[PDB]
Amino acid sequence: ALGSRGMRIREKLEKELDPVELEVEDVSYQHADDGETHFNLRIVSDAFQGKSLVKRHRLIYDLLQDELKSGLHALSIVAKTPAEV
């Protein structure tokens, strides 16, 4: 399935957000093993309660910043609470 970066991204989000639903989709092929440069993320987590869309976005970027500083180019983020699905 996922390459090494994809697996790290999934594990980091699982560890920090304990999401009820999590999808990590490598879409590097759309922009270019293709490099693991682009992922779509769909995360359903309690941790987003009370946070604006942009705050949720920035939270995820912060958690994954080490990837962004070493080959990860873009993340497309859908971040919802269980109450929102």
Curated annotation (Swiss-Prot):
Expressed in roots, leaves, stems and flowers. Disruption phenotype: Embryonic lethality when homozygous. Disulfide bonds: none annotated. Glutathionylated. Glutathionylation strongly reduces the stimulation of NFS2 activity. It comes from the Eukaryota. It is found in: Plastid, Chloroplast stroma; Mitochondrion. Over-expression of SUFE1 leads to retarded growth and chlorosis. Participates in cysteine desulfurization mediated by NFS2 in chloroplast and NIFS1 in mitochondrion. Activates the cysteine desulfurase activity of NFS2. Cysteine desulfurization mobilizes sulfur from L-cysteine to yield L-alanine and supplies the inorganic sulfur for iron-sulfur (Fe-S) cluster formation. Glutaredoxins regulate SUFE1 activity by inducing its reduction and deglutathionylation. Belongs to the SufE family. Heterotetramer with NFS2. Interacts with NFS2 and NIFS1. Interacts in vitro with GRXS14, GRXS15, GRXS16 and GRXS17, but not with GRXC5. Interacts in vivo only with GRXS14 and GRXS16. This is SufE-like protein 1, chloroplastic/mitochondrial. It comes from Arabidopsis thaliana. The gene is SUFE1. The chain holds residues 277 to 371 of 371 of the full protein.
